[PDB]
Amino acid sequence: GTRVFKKASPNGKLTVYLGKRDFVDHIDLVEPVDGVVLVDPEYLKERRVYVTLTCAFRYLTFRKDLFVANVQFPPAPEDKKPLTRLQERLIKKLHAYPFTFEIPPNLPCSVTLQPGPEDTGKACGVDYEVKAFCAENLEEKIHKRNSVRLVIRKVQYAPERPGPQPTAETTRQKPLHLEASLDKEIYYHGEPISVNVHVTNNTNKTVKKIKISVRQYADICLAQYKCPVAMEEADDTVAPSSTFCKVYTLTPFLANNREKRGLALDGKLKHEDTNLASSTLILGIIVSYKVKVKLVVSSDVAVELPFTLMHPKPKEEPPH
């Protein structure tokens, strides 16, 4: 069979059904946020029922909106076309009528910037709230009455099939030649990123220290946020006039990262744990990652590789 979400209003006078909480972007398109609402004609003297989709943002504080969309009980006289396969089965199962929202391409994804412990308000980020309501006037000051708020997510995960290798070259001045590369285009949360490091130091001075980091890039446009999610400060030295090779390994995980106020996480529904933000393949938050190889000489040198931190396309179900 299957399972769905069925939040209803505080006074029994309205109910929202959703098939799921997450919607996915195949890059050039976006899934429709599609559901049905049960309506009560016997309460509904106001004579109109409407549903809202809102791509909000939260950041004293600012609450913005990046996208707002609305849809028509009594049934629309002509807009019967976009009824989705999911909705028709609730229609069969139940006085309930569709609501649907095709978020346009080139809009941000479900990103929860951290709820830093020092703050207690609603979490920052691009939260998708679907808000079904009954009203007499679409301009009325919406009270806590028969409306039902429900947060959703719109997300992106692993780009299937093989892709280009994050090979890189950088040299400084004889040459201090630095090369690094990974083994895959895409990589996954919490797994080891295989960091290769070739160095040829024709200078007199020693490479004092080597840092590998994996760094989180999240562009905020309501600016961009930069923070290292992982780091390996190996002691290996490229001795003067030598050829060097080493393979490093790092794993980025949230566990240590919780204290770094302002990181970005995959969209929280309520307060449940999620992975660090899957990369975005535009307003809002656009998030991507790189593996960084740095050499410290007794005076730094570095190379920085395009790293796609993501999650496999989950075939079984969404997170939770």
């Epitope: 919490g190 794993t251 995980f253 949230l254 240590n256 992975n275 999650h311 997170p319």
Partner: antibody, heavy 116, light 106 residues
Framework: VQLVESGGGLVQPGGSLRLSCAAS????????IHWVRQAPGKGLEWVAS???????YYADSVKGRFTISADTSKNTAYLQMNSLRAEDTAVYYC?????????????WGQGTLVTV | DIQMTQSPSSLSASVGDRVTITCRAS??????VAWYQQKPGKAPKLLIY???SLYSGVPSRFSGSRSGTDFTLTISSLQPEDFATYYC?????????FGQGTKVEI
């Protein structure tokens, strides 16, 4: 891909143990490691779980006595034991599960016998 | 402590039998249920997850099911290699109580 644990043996009650669980083919931070015991002729009892990605859970029937940890650089867990008792006598296992997302315990080690 | 009430404690299931396990929790755990198979003395092994999905490495004869907060692992047809002790397991709440186990013998 494998799990193998060691450290089972005889101890009189009041003793301690340090079971270990090496594995290959997967890494701890992508996975959650567990211990479970099948006491003589009886069924499985959850004892402890470590969710590597997030920073540890272990049951009331073991609480304050059994403790789970892992050493990451060598892809291994532990199950430190204090104030063991007679009922603790069980053959102990180690287990791994997909952390993202927790989909039940996928692989188990061959089993090690502990008697108190 | 969700009393993850699994039964029967043992079952004779001749080859070809429709082995079926009921399993009632004392509390709602949504769909977060796994199942495992233990061959005498060694590693248990997961058969079903998300209370429905079959794990990679598991013969398709194993099947997850659900109705309310009853969970039920099922084998379409029990082969000679199946016999072991199987365990329901809910994994929404801590403790993650396994069922006391249904042992199967010829």
């Amino acid at each position: 891909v494998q799990l193998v644990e060691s450290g089972g043996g005889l101890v009189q009650p009041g003793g301690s143990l340090r079971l270990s669980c090496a594995a290959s083919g997967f890494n701890v931070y992508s996975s959650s490691i567990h211990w479970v015991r099948q006491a003589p002729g009886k069924g499985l009892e959850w004892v402890a779980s470590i969710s590597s990605y997030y920073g540890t859970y272990y049951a009331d029937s073991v609480k304050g006595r059994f403790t789970i940890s892992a050493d990451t650089s060598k892809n291994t867990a532990y199950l430190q034991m204090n104030s063991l008792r007679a009922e603790d006598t069980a053959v102990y296992y180690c287990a791994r599960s997909r952390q993202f997302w927790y989909s039940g315990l996928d692989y188990w080690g061959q089993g090690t016998l502990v008697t108190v | 402590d969700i009393q993850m009430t699994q039964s029967p404690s043992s079952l004779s299931a001749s080859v070809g039998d429709r082995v079926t396990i009921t399993c009632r929790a004392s509390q709602s755990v949504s769909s977060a249920v796994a199942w495992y198979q233990q061959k005498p003395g060694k590693a248990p092994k997961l058969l079903i997850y998300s209370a429905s999905s079959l794990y990679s490495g598991v013969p398709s004869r194993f099947s997850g099911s659900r109705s309310g907060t009853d969970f039920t692992l099922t084998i379409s047809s029990l082969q000679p290699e199946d016999f072991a002790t199987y365990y329901c397991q809910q994994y929404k709440y801590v403790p993650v109580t396994f069922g006391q186990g249904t042992k199967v013998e010829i």
